[PDB]
């Protein structure tokens, strides 16, 4: 369907080793999107090809209120482009870099939406996400969670089926992954535990700048609990950050159903979470469609400037 010329390139949202994300406007509809533009040479050079094709399939195949939606994929001679829905609220990382701690109510709201999304990925799509983190969690214009970055997903993973790839983000890696063991979908609940910990405690549960020291903490140290934490929050964090995945909350046959039943989530009607009938704790305060106040000035102040990826190109329908 579309090419580079079907879009206006407005604001830089972010940039990294593999490319950039630009706030774009679709000429034909006036609708705003975020276009992820990756450098083919970098992707090939870093051996990222299968990840990019995995992200593409997972985005195409998923339809969920808390997963980032994809409208178009296409490519050029030297570029791969994902046109995704724009999330004006930025990353959770942006907000926690400024607030330091969310209230338990606010953390509960996001936690419930993340659970909803991961449950769908596991149960409906047979996908394990593997890279949950503050950077990959965005807020849409209404204040709802959007998971991003599906390049590390494992596809075709059923109930207890296991995985081998050493991957994720170092600070977030589960013990069983660091043990060099085959691991299952419960790695996602470890990642949920680290994210909830960060939201409610204002730091990672395990941290060293040195990865060997970091990995040692993850494997060896019990989590610390700030004295501000309520008992059900403590219990939830304690259960999600069990080092043995067989003992982790969500680590059995019932997967996410076990987390949903936990008393930390006692207020929560899961069908209302999905139907988005629960009032968000924060609505992004934007003055226009192009207000990028929830993206780093470092990026937004900047001016905008070998192989064929088979079966990449895509356009959404309904």
């Amino acid at each position: 369907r579309v090419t580079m010329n079907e879009f206006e390139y407005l604001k830089l949202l972010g940039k990294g080793t593999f490319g950039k994300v630009i706030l774009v406007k679709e000429k034909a509809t006036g609708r705003y999107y975020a276009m992820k533009i990756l450098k083919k040479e970098v992707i090939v050079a870093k051996d990222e090809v299968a990840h990019t094709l995995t992200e593409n399939r997972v985005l195409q195949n998923s339809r969920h209120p808390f997963l980032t939606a994809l409208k178009y994929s296409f490519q050029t001679h030297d570029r791969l482009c994902f046109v995704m829905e724009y999330a004006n609220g930025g990353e959770l990382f942006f907000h926690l870099s400024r607030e330091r701690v969310f209230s338990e109510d606010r953390a509960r709201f996001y936690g419930a939406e993340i659970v909803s999304a991961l449950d769908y990925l596991h149960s409906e799509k047979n996908v394990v996400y593997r890279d949950l983190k503050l950077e990959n969690l965005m807020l849409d214009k209404d204040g709802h969670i959007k998971i991003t970055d599906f390049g590390l997903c494992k596809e075709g993973i059923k109930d207890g089926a296991t995985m081998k790839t050493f991957c994720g983000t170092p600070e977030y890696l589960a013990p069983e992954v660091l043990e060099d063991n085959d691991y299952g979908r419960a790695v996602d609940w470890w990642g949920l535990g680290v994210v909830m910990y960060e939201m409610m405690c204002g730091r990672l549960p395990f941290y060293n700048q040195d990865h060997e020291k970091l990995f040692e903490l993850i494997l060896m140290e019990e989590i610390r609990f700030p004295r501000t934490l309520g008992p059900e929050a403590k219990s939830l964090l304690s259960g999600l950050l069990k080092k043995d995945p067989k003992q982790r909350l969500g680590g059995g046959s019932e997967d996410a159903k076990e987390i949903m039943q936990h008393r930390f989530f006692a207020g929560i009607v899961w069908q209302h979470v999905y139907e988005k009938k629960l009032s968000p704790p924060f609505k992004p305060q934007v003055t226009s469609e192009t207000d990028t106040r929830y993206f780093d000035e470092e990026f937004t102040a900047q001016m905008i400037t070998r192989p064929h990826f088979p079966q990449f190109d895509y356009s959404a329908s309904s």
Binding site: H51, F93, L96, S97, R100, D131, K133, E135, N136, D149, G151, L152, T165, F166, C167, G168, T169, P170, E171, Y172, G202, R203, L204, Y207
Partner: peptide
């Protein structure tokens, strides 16, 4: 707080 993190695979 913490610096931005980086996803990886081996």
């Amino acid at each position: 707080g913490r610096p931005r993190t980086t996803s990886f695979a081996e």
